[PDB]
Design a protein around this ligand. Structure first.
Ligand SMILES: CC[C@@H]([C@H](C)O)n1ncn(-c2ccc(N3CCN(c4ccc(OC[C@@H]5CO[C@@](Cn6cncn6)(c6ccc(F)cc6F)C5)cc4)CC3)cc2)c1=O
Ligand code: HEM
Ligand SMILES: CCCCCCCCCCCCO[C@@H]1O[C@H](CO)[C@@H](O[C@H]2O[C@H](CO)[C@@H](O)[C@H](O)[C@H]2O)[C@H](O)[C@H]1O
Length: 527
């Protein structure tokens, strides 16, 4: 026995004396073996969801999850049911699929899970300090209340002619169109739609000055910041490379530009109700009396604009891509436009937009088939018991909810991979609570989150951009439809999504051919 412990020490001594070829080998062999041995032992636990088996330690199932997460989820669901875990670049992700998973994650108690712990490294290096996920949840709650204050029906009534003007200016001036000189052409929708999205969102949310900045070489800083918004930040939020230096420079340069305008407005008492900058200047005091700083206001503007940027641009790209092979839908949308707008002799308004159910259904169905965020995360902060099961999700795990997966299940949407706006006949609203409501600090929202359709999430982290997105996408598509027909180049079809980008944007290049419905039509104004 004691003789055995001497040979332990002797063996530790011969271990250290191995050739570095074998020391390195054992430094790879041993973690690999322990990994398999640990999973086998882990698979015995009754109080843990099944864990997806994986060969490479730390890396885990990262590759297949990034490649095709919904296909990854469907196979895991067939072997294990609706709750299962997998490891992901160092973390254990516990997936809860379906409406009860929406309920488990979106309505989790604030003490149990943390969104800022999952997201802060993704967003803080892009947006700046102090806001969104670089702050306590109750600060986020009031930030959402401040922003929502500029997102009112009356705000939407004035945004509509502004967004319309921007769309027409883009048809007139952009290289991709020039409708006054060309009656047909080919565009890449991942080129045109990010540009149309930033032009229209700038003009309406940021205001006339910040929109004017985009006609200068200042627009290059927006490109730099936009490039810093990448899921690489989940792993490498700060690397001493040039990518990160352009991003950081841009955040300072852009937030400096907003602080410049904010300070000029306050210095001149020029604070109105024009844009979200005005609104946050008048309404950014937290409930404990602390005011947001001009730096925090500008970082919140960056965040709101940048999140809205990627979700909205991806969605209008998909709308265009689904309609390019559906000339029947384009025709039906065109007729609705002629009826609602008296043949075009009525100007588009926010209220008339609400009388365009097929247009809004087309947005709604695109968001069904293309949730821009396939996976939403929380870090588990206290152990969580999974109701009706033996499972306990321990602190340090992550929970993963995926309403976009349920969007594509035939159980809840018959023929789920068919694009059919008519599945929403009589139900064209962007969403609506099926019953009771609750207020986390930014307005009463649906208490239950068991709806199989959840493009905007639910609970305390629920989107507040839904009506701005519909207003923006609504004006934009109304004008596209009334102005152009479009179709695919020959043999091309809807592309598959890129599930490794920030949003589930289409795999490019994704080109459509447009044509003027009225070749002789000319867009006025000066260029
Ligand atoms: C390593 C080998 C490699 C090979 C090649 O496979 N590989 N292997 C694996 N993968 C891989 C695997 C998975 C992924 N990602 C999964 C995670 N996704 C993701 C994206 C965004 C997320 O957003 C978090 C918040 C929520 O709200 C937002 C956004 N927002 C809401 N409304 C408007 N904006 C928000 C809110 C408020 C604001 F004010 C602002 C905001 F922005 C931000 C959360 C999750 C990205 C894709 C990527 C790659 C690989 O590439
Ligand atoms: C197609 C358009 C959009 C979709 C599908 C969408 C989706 C979502 C989802 C699913 C969440 C919840 C994330 C989570 O629970 O982890 C969210 C949150 C949020 N979104 Fe959007 N969004 C869209 C557009 C916008 C726009 C246009 C804005 C701003 C103008 C915006 C601002 C926000 C904010 C401020 C939050 C709250 C983040 C939090 O509380 O953690 N979104 N959105
Ligand atoms: C006897 C018949 C007489 C008929 C009288 C008719 C009165 C009509 C009154 C219209 C009310 C709209 O008036 C005003 O609209 C603006 C929108 O630009 C709103 O402004 C709102 O959106 C803007 C733009 O994001 C934000 O900067 C602002 O913080 C927000 O509150 C005002 O909060 C609202 O007060």
């Amino acid at each position: 026995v004691g003789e055995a412990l001497e040979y332990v020490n002797i063996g530790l001594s011969h271990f250290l004396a191995l050739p570095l070829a074998q020391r390195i080998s054992l430094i790879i062999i041993i973690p690999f073996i322990y990994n398999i041995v640990w999973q086998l032992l882990y698979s015995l636990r009754k109080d843990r969801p099944p864990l997806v088996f994986y060969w490479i330690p730390w890396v885990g199932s990262a590759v297949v999850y990034g490649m095709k997460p919904y296909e990854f989820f469907e196979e895991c669901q067939k072997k294990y049911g609706d709750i299962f875990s997998f490891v992901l670049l160092g973390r254990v992700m516990t997936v809860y699929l379906g409406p009860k998973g929406h309920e488990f994650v979106f309505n989790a108690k604030l003490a149990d899970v943390s969104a800022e712990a999952a997201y802060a490294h993704l967003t803080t290096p892009v947006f700046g300090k102090g806001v969104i996920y670089d702050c306590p949840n109750s600060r986020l709650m009031e930030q959402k209340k401040f922003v929502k204050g500029a997102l009112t029906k009356e705000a939407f009534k004035s945004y509509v002619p502004l967004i319309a003007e921007e769309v027409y200016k883009y048809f007139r001036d952009s290289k991709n169109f020039r409708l006054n000189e060309r009656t047909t052409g080919t565009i890449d929708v991942m080129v045109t739609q990010p540009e149309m999205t930033i032009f229209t969102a700038s003009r309406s949310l940021l205001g006339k000055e910040m929109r004017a900045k985009l006609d200068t070489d200042f627009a290059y800083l927006y490109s730099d910041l936009d490039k810093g918004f990448t899921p690489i930040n989940f792993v490498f939020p700060n690397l001493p490379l040039e990518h990160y230096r352009k991003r950081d420079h841009a955040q300072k340069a852009i937030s400096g530009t907003y602080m410049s305008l904010i300070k000029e407005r306050r210095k001149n008492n020029d604070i109105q109700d024009r844009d979200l900058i005005d609104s946050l200047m008048k309404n950014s005091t937290y409930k404990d009396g602390v005011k947001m700083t001009d730096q925090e206001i500008a970082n919140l503007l960056i965040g709101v604009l940048m999140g809205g940027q990627h979700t909205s641009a991806a969605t209008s790209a998909w709308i265009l891509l689904h309609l390019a092979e559906r000339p029947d839908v384009q025709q039906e949308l065109y007729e609705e436009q002629m009826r609602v707008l008296d043949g075009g002799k009525k100007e588009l308004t926010y209220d008339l937009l609400q009388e365009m159910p097929l247009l809004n259904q087309t947005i709604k169905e695109t968001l069904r088939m293309h949730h821009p965020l396939h996976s939403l995360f929380r870090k588990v902060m206290k152990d969580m018991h999974v109701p009706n099961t033996s499972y306990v999700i321990p602190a340090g795990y992550h929970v993963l909810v995926s309403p976009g997966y349920t969007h594509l299940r035939d159980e809840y949407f018959p023929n789920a991979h068919q694009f059919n706006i008519h599945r929403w006949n009589n139900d064209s609203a962007s969403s609506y609570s099926v019953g009771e409501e609750v207020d986390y600090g930014f307005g009463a929202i649906s208490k239950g989150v068991s709806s199989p359709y959840l493009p905007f999430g639910g609970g305390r982290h629920r989107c507040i951009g839904e009506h701005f997105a519909y207003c923006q996408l609504g004006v934009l598509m109304s004008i596209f439809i009334r102005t152009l027909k479009w179709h695919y180049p020959e043999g091309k079809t809807v592309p598959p999504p890129d599930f490794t980008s920030m949003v589930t944007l289409p795999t490019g290049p994704a080109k459509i051919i447009w044509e003027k419905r009225n070749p002789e039509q000319k867009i006025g104004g000066r260029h």
